[PDB]
Design an enzyme around this catalytic site. Structure first.
Site, PDB file in Angstrom:
ATOM      1  N   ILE B  48     -41.252   1.945  19.629  1.00  0.00           N
ATOM      2  CA  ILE B  48     -40.060   1.154  19.324  1.00  0.00           C
ATOM      3  C   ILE B  48     -40.062   0.674  17.873  1.00  0.00           C
ATOM      4  CG2 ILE B  48     -38.773  -0.964  19.826  1.00  0.00           C
ATOM      5  CD1 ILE B  48     -39.900  -0.719  22.706  1.00  0.00           C
ATOM      6  N   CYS B  49     -41.207   0.172  17.409  1.00  0.00           N
ATOM      7  CA  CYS B  49     -41.331  -0.252  16.007  1.00  0.00           C
ATOM      8  C   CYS B  49     -41.115   0.942  15.078  1.00  0.00           C
ATOM      9  CB  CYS B  49     -42.693  -0.876  15.710  1.00  0.00           C
ATOM     10  SG  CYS B  49     -42.923  -2.457  16.553  1.00  0.00           S
ATOM     11  N   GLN B  50     -41.648   2.114  15.439  1.00  0.00           N
ATOM     12  CA  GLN B  50     -41.423   3.339  14.655  1.00  0.00           C
ATOM     13  C   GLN B  50     -39.929   3.616  14.515  1.00  0.00           C
ATOM     14  OE1 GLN B  50     -44.309   5.640  13.602  1.00  0.00           O
ATOM     15  NE2 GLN B  50     -42.669   5.843  12.091  1.00  0.00           N
ATOM     16  N   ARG B 120     -39.852  -9.391  18.211  1.00  0.00           N
ATOM     17  CA  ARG B 120     -38.898  -8.706  17.360  1.00  0.00           C
ATOM     18  C   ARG B 120     -37.855  -9.683  16.843  1.00  0.00           C
ATOM     19  NH1 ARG B 120     -40.522  -3.376  17.732  1.00  0.00           N
ATOM     20  NH2 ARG B 120     -41.403  -2.901  19.797  1.00  0.00           N
TER      21      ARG B 120
END
Lengths: 154, 157
Positions: B48-50, B120
């Site tokens: 998800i961060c990618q 996030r």
């Protein structure tokens, strides 16, 4: 102050690079355990040391012995590093609480917030039988690790 | 540390952090010059961060220009961020909230005390250092970057 030979190895439960729980206690009565604390993934000296461990893995992972590498990095960091370096042994996350296991072994660097290069062999009874701590710029000698492990079987 | 996420109207806590090349980056340095997007992310090398930072990378001109800057912040140390950035082609700053662990994240009220990672959280800090946009998604949720550029566009000139 680093724990010495003769001390009980503090128990821990930590996530490996695949988010699976690994406990020191689980090896008791079964295998001698090499514990390799390292400061940071993706650094030259750490790369060299774990590369040597990888290159001689059958001497560290067998019927008599297991090896666990431990640092403050979280599992995703260790997963990518392990995949790219070909590390198939457990890299464990002393991540949160930050450095708690490293502190329990007396090998945590309070200033930098990383584990120093401490190494231990824990026997089948959970007693520390080998303990080293190296100064910067030097690489630990893996021949000592295998010799110490060999001495606790035959 | 605040007990909740900081909201619009609050002063953005100042920080000085090492980027992926061990260079000091300070929020104060942007004051009077640019609006700053702060993108807290939980962990480098996660899907998800990618995806989120890839989207930031792919639309970087909307975030790094004469009016705006963008800083990604997480508890990882610089070497982790350096390798991730090189391999992902991230040329924007990734800052290390590493030691003390999560201190800046805690100051913004977006630290996850259980997991030991930043949630996030996203903020836009205006030229006066006031938070003008604030959101917090959990590590399993994805953020809408259209809101980021919208909020930045609304503060231009």
């Amino acid at each position: 102050v680093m724990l010495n030979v003769g001390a009980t190895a503090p128990d821990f439960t930590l996530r490996d690079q695949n988010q699976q729980l690994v406990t020191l206690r689980g090896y008791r009565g079964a295998k001698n355990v090499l514990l390799v604390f390292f400061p940071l993934a993706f650094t030259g000296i750490c790369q060299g040391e774990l590369d040597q461990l990888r290159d001689h893995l059958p001497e560290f992972e067998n019927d008599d012995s297991a090896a666990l590498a431990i640092s403050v990095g979280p599992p995703p960091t260790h997963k990518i590093w392990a995949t790219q370096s070909g590390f198939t042994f457990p890299l464990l996350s002393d991540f949160w609480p930050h450095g708690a296991v490293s502190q329990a072994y007396g090998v945590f660097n309070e200033q930098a917030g990383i584990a120093n290069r401490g190494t231990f062999v824990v026997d089948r009874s959970g007693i520390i039988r080998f303990a080293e701590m190296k100064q910067p710029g030097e690489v630990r000698d893996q021949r000592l690790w295998t010799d110490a492990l060999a001495a606790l079987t035959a």
